Write a protein that binds this ligand. Structure first.
Ligand code: CK4
Length: 290
């Protein structure tokens, strides 16, 4: 670990704090994540081989005196920040479509290898000036865990949590990542969080008010779910046209499929790549201020 020279507190994730570091030898710039059971070690170590242009490369893993340091390739900005920096004008559709396409690409890769992110969010998507967007902290949720809180003396964000997780499902699948990406997608379009809940019940109810209270009709087995309460208010489904304006019909169609209540009905990353919405997909360059 004495091989790096901390440069600045780049972040403060749920696993631990993140610093920008300079490998004293190669001089390469990396993102140093200081965070353990051997199980985790095998887990976060298998990730070292999961490489993809849209996945933030996990350079190395340093476990010294029960201190877990994760070294990732460095990117100068996350989407949350770019999104805030594009607040007045918003991100150009072409760029939105390119980012989702690449993210769907990263997801398809991870999912084909049976790896889930489990906690996608704007702060976990990093961009470079090349017009590239990558998934950060991938597979780090299973490798460890994810409580309502943490040591960072901070609050978790459930804004992007799929309903099956909120309803008590313990064996959720890759479909939770698609739900999360759907929320981010809607957020890139509206420049406003889709379901900014402040508690699990508020989170679930904001979803309910927009997509309608799920029942056995649209979600077979939903009432069997652990945290399902026959007493949930019965909300009507609000037309999607009112959810993500002014996204066009192709996008609203893709989004609605990424937000299906039934995980099994929810569109897969691989299948989303063949959606008409990306028929005219390109790769524009963003304008970043570093
Ligand atoms: C949480 C994170 N986990 C990883 C692996 C992260 C990472 C890896 C490489 N680069 C970056 N860059 C970055 C750049 C700017 C910001 C901020 F805070 F200004 F928005 C936040 C993050 N972050 S952030």
């Amino acid at each position: 670990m004495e091989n790096f020279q901390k440069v600045e507190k780049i972040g403060e994730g749920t696993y631990g704090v993140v610093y920008k570091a300079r490998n004293k030898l190669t001089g390469e710039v990396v993102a140093l994540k200081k965070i353990v059971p051997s199980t985790a070690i095998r887990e976060i170590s298998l990730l070292k081989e999961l490489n993809h242009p849209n996945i933030v490369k996990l350079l190395d893993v340093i476990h010294t005196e029960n201190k877990l340091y994760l070294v990732f390739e460095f990117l100068h900005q996350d989407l949350k920040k770019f999104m805030d920096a594009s607040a007045l004008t918003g991100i150009p559709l072409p760029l939105i479509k390119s980012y989702l396409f690449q993210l769907l690409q990263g997801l398809a890769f991870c999912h084909s290898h049976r790896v889930l992110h489990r906690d996608l969010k704007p702060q976990n998507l990093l961009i470079n000036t090349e017009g590239a967007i990558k998934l950060a902290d991938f597979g780090l949720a299973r490798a460890f865990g994810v409580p309502v809180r943490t040591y960072t003396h901070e609050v978790v964000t459930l804004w992007y949590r799929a309903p099956e997780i909120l309803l008590g499902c313990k064996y959720y699948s890759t479909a939770v990542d698609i739900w999360s990406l759907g929320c981010i997608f809607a957020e890139m379009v509206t420049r406003r969080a889709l379901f900014p809940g402040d508690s699990e019940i508020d989170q679930l109810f904001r979803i309910f008010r927009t997509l309608g209270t799920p029942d056995e009709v649209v979600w077979p087995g939903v009432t069997s779910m652990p945290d399902y309460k026959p007493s949930f208010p019965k909300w009507a489904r609000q037309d999607f046209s009112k959810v993500v304006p002014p996204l066009d019909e192709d996008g609203r169609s893709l989004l609605s499929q990424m937000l299906h209540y039934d995980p099994n009905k929810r569109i897969s990353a691989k299948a989303a790549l063949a959606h008409p919405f990306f028929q005219d997909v390109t790769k524009p360059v963003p304008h970043l201020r570093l």
